[PDB]
Structure formats: C-alpha cells, structure tokens
Amino acid sequence: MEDMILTEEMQKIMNLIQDDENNVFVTGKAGSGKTTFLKYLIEKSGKNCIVAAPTGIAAINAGGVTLHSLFGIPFGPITPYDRLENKFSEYKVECLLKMELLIIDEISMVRPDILDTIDRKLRWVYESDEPFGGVQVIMFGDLFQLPPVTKKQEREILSDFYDGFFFFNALVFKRTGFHIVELTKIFRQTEPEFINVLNNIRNYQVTSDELDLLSELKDRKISSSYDNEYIHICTHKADVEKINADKLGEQEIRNYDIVIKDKFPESSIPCDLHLKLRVGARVMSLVNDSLKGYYNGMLGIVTALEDNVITVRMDNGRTIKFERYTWSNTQYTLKDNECVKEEIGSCTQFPLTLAWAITIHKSQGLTFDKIIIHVSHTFCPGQLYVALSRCRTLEGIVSDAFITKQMIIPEYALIDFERAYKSEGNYYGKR
Ligand SMILES: Nc1ncnc2c1ncn2[C@@H]1O[C@H](COP(=O)(O)OP(=O)(O)O)[C@@H](O)[C@H]1O
Numbered sequence: 001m002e003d004m005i006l007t008e009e010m011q012k013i014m015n016l017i018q019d020d021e022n023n024v025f026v027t028g029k030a031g032s033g034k035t036t037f038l039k040y041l042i043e044k045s046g047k048n049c050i051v052a053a054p055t056g057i058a059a060i061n062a063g064g065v066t067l068h069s070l071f072g073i074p075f076g077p078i079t080p081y082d083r084l085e086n087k088f089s090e091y092k093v094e095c096l097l098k099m100e101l102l103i104i105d106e107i108s109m110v111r112p113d114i115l116d117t118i119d120r121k122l123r124w125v126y127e128s129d130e131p132f133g134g135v136q137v138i139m140f141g142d143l144f145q146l147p148p149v150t151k152k153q154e155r156e157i158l159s160d161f162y163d164g165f166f167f168f169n170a171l172v173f174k175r176t177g178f179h180i181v182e183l184t185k186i187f188r189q190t191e192p193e194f195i196n197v198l199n200n201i202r203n204y205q206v207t208s209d210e211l212d213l214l215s216e217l218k219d220r221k222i223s224s225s226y227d228n229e230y231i232h233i234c235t236h237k238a239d240v241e242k243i244n245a246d247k248l249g250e251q252e253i254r255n256y257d258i259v260i261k262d263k264f265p266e267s268s269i270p271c272d273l274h275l276k277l278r279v280g281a282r283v284m285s286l287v288n289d290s291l292k293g294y295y296n297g298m299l300g301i302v303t304a305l306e307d308n309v310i311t312v313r314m315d316n317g318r319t320i321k322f323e324r325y326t327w328s329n330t331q332y333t334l335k336d337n338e339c340v341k342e343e344i345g346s347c348t349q350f351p352l353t354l355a356w357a358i359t360i361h362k363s364q365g366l367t368f369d370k371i372i373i374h375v376s377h378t379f380c381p382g383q384l385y386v387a388l389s390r391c392r393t394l395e396g397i398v399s400d401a402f403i404t405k406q407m408i409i410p411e412y413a414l415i416d417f418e419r420a421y422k423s424e425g426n427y428y429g430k431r
Contacts, residue, residue: 003290004036007033007185009182009184010033010183012181016179017041017101022136023136023137023138023176023177024138025180026038026181027140027181028184029142030142030367030389031188031189031367034141034142035062035105037183038103038105041103042103048339049103050070050095050099050332051065051103052102052105053067053105053106058105060268060327062106064103064105065331065332070092071088071118071121072085072092073117073118077153078114078117079113079158084117086121086125093125096126097125099339100136102132102135103139103140104140105140106145107167108141108143108166109145109148110167111147112168113170115167115170115172116170116172118132119132131172137178143418144414146380146382146386147166164413166413168417168429173428174429174430176430177427177428177429177431178428178429180421188367191393193394197394201384202385202410202411204408206408211404214399215402215403215404217373217397217399218400218401220400222398223398223399226243226247226356230371231356231357231358231372232357232372232374233360233373235374239357240357240358243357244355247281247354248278252278254276254305256274256277258347258348259347260346260348261346262345263329264345265329270286271325271327271351272349272353275352275353276354281302281354282299282302282355282356283302283312284297284298284299284355284358285298285352286352292320294320297366297367298315299355299369300314300320309321309322309323322351322352323350325348325349326348327346328346329343329344329345329347330342360383360386367391367392368390368391368396371398372399373387373388373390373403374399375403375404380409381409381410382410382414384407385408
C-alpha cells in the first residue's frame with residue numbers, strides 16, 4: 001500500500017513503541033486498519049520484528065509463524081509448574097536472542113497460559129528474570145472477538161491458577177503491563193448510528209428505542225430463502241456445509257484440487273482443498289488485490305469456468321478473471337548472522353469459496369453489505385453482538401426471528417477490563 005492513511009491513533013502507537021519498555025495492545029473493530037497498520041509498523045521502527053499468531057491461518061495471513069512453532073509449545077493446558085522440554089535449534093535460539101520486538105496478531109484468541117509459557121521460554125533463553133526476557137511486545141486484535149471455547153480438561157487444569165480465560169488474565173501481566181490504543185476509523189465506511197447500537201449492545205446499555213430497531217430486522221420470508229444478495233451468518237460448520245452444498249447442486253460441477261509444494265501444515269491452509277464450483281455459484285474472495293480490484297470478503301457470482309481461470313461478476317458490477325493464488329508458509333532463520341524469514345512451503349488454489357453461508361468463525365474480521373442472522377435461541381455471551389457486527393449497516397441486517405432483550409448477554413470481564421484501563425491511563429497491568 002502506497003495508499004495508507006496515517007491517523008492520529010496510529011502515530012500515537014508509534015510514539016509509544018519508541019520507548020523500548022512500552023508493551024502495546026492495538027485494538028479495534030473490523031475495517032479499522034489493523035493488519036495494514038501492522039505492516040506499516042514493521043517497516044517503520046528499528047527492530048528486528050518477529051510476527052506470530054495463535055493459528056496457522058492467522059499466521060499465514062499475517063505472514064508470520066504460529067506461537068506454538070516459534071516457541072516449541074506442546075498443544076495443551078500448561079500450568080506454571082508443568083515442566084517444559086525447551087530446546088529449539090541454534091537458529092531458533094539465536095533468532096529469539098536477536099528479536100527486539102515480538103508482535104502477536106489475534107491476541108484475543110490466545111488462551112492466557114500460552115502467554116505465560118512464552119514468557120517462561122523467553123526468560124530461559126535470555127537467561128533473564130525480566131518479563132519476556134526484556135523483549136518488547138505489541139499485541140493486535142479485537143477484544144470482543146469471542147475467544148475459542150475452553151474444553152473440559154482445559155478449564156479444569158487451568159482454573160486452579162487463572163482468574164480468567166482471556167489473554168489479559170496471563171500471570172505475566174502481574175509483573176508487566178501494556179498501554180492500549182483503539183483504532184477508531186473504519187476506512188471502508190462510516191455509519192455512526194449503527195456502530196453506536198453495536199457499542200450499546202456490547203456495554204449492556206441499550207434503549208427501548210434501540211430494541212425497537214432490533215425487532216424490525218425480522219423478515220422470516222427472506223431468512224428462509226437462498227436466492228438473494230444476503231449471506232447467512234451461521235454459528236456451526238455443518239449448517240453452512242449444508243446450505244452451500246444444497247445450493248451448489250450436482251449439475252455441471254467443476255472441481256479444482258489444491259496444490260502443495262514442500263512443507264505446509266494442514267491447519268494453516270486458508271482455502272478449499274477441493275474447490276467445487278458451477279456457473280451461478282455464489283462466492284467470496286479470499287485475498288486483497290487492489291490491482292485486480294478485489295478485497296478479502298468481496299462477494300460475486302460465477303459467470304464462467306475454465307481450467308486455469310474463473311470469471312466472476314462482483315456485486316459492484318465489475319467482472320474479474322480469477323487466477324490461482326499461492327500462499328507462502330514461512331519461518332524465521334539466520335542468514336549472515338541476521339534473523340530473517342524463509343519460505344519452507346506453499347499451497348496454490350483459486351482464492352474463492354462458496355459464499356451462500358459463512359460461519360461466525362470463518363467470517364471473523366469481515367463485513368458484508370447484506371446478511372441473514374439466525375437468533376439461535378440458546379445464546380452465549382456477546383454472540384448477538386458478533387453476528388450483527390458482520391454487517392456494515394443496520395438496514396443490511398435481516399433476522400430470522402425477533403431480536404429480544406433476552407438475546408443480549410454481556411461479557412462483563414470485557415466491560416470491566418475496558419472500563420478500568422479507560423480510566424487508569426489507557427494502561428493495564430503492573431507499571
Ligand atoms: N491505514 C489505512 N489507510 C487507508 N485505507 C485502509 C487502511 N487500512 C485499511 N484500509 C482499507 O480498509 C480495508 C480493511 O482491511 P484491514 O486493514 O485488514 O482492517 P482490519 O484488519 O482492522 O479489519 C483494507 O482492504 C483497505 O482497503
């Protein structure tokens with residue numbers, strides 16, 4: 001991007017990382033500029049940056065590595081007194097010793113014992129007692145993104161040692177802390193009444209005039225129809241696999257296999273393994289190309305299918321010939337006694353997927369012109385907020401049943417965390 005707008009909030013963040021002791025949590029909603037400012041922040045700073053994420057797909061997308069692979073953490077709940085097999089390699093140790101800045105994308109998805117373990121490994125590597133071995137830490141993401149649900153034994157082992165299952169519940173945050181900065185500008189659009197509604201929902205202060213609005217979105221006839229510009233936000237995998245499958249059909253189906261070269265982890269693949277399409281299929285772009293004219297999340301309709309090309313008419317009327325795209329799986333290594341990234345593998349596939357319906361999870365980070373929300377009756381805290389944040393307007397939302405005060409379940413650990421640091425200096429943890 002030679003396009004980047006640099007806002008007051010971004011410069012505020014760069015001012016503070018300048019002081020090598022300042023950890024920073026960079027937060028903001030979808031379309032807030034986070035991953036674009038992330039790239040801005042690697043280039044503009046000194047520092048030896050390392051870029052990690054809690055999942056392969058987020059790692060690939062941010063162009064870093066998983067936290068587990070970088071730091072060699074077995075998957076599972078880890079108490080402070082669970083002992084670590086900590087080796088890595090001579091390249092890895094040496095990379096971590098040169099790291100001047102650790103950047104973690106999608107931090108709200110980091111179950112806090114992960115943070116503490118990373119802290120243990122970096123004290124053992126630097127042979128220091130300082131938090132994170134002194135490494136400076138920038139954290140990116142959206143607080144009100146739902147963290148991954150903790151399994152049976154997970155909450156078991158861990159509840160003994162943690163007051164919470166959110167990333168800021170990490171024990172290290174008793175010994176260190178971080179500033180907070182909200183990215184407030186939504187570049188693709190600006191719609192104040194709707195975003196106010198969303199913020200009243202997430203803070204559990206919400207008018208009867210707002211509840212009137214929410215009951216309007218009900219249209220049961222549309223909700224039950226798959227011929228439309230609307231994408232169904234659904235909670236669970238298989239309702240989507242069923243909607244996207246049933247609309248596809250058996251008629252005139254083209255199938256396109258993924259291609260893997262060298263080393264790619266199965267869970268880091270952010271595209272279809274077997275892409276099954278037909279003229280008429282409804283689809284969504286998986287990558288940003290400003291030159292071709294598509295963004296990740298852009299919806300269109302297939303108008304033709306060839307071997308190496310897929311032609312799609314998007315909702316903005318443009319027509320785009322999609323070609324296979326290649327995703328690169330990297331890792332950190334030494335070249336010339338400098339820590340640099342290197343490609344260890346690849347996966348190649350057309351960057352589209354069937355879009356009649358998308359999970360709440362796979363749609364993390366995205367917004368659409370038109371959406372169909374399913375009030376799932378039984379509800380989990382913050383769920384209604386998530387579902388509605390997938391739209392860009394109020395008037396673009398359609399609910400399958402009335403939206404009721406019942407459906408609004410606050411997450412109070414988040415409102416308080418938010419409430420505190422907002423009055424405590426935009427800082428949380430030990431000063
Ligand atoms: N700093 C910026 N300046 C100008 N436009 C931006 C900026 N950041 C994002 N955009 C636009 O908004 C879109 C949102 O993408 P992204 O930066 O990934 O936001 P987020 O990750 O916070 O949802 C981009 O496709 C881009 O076209």
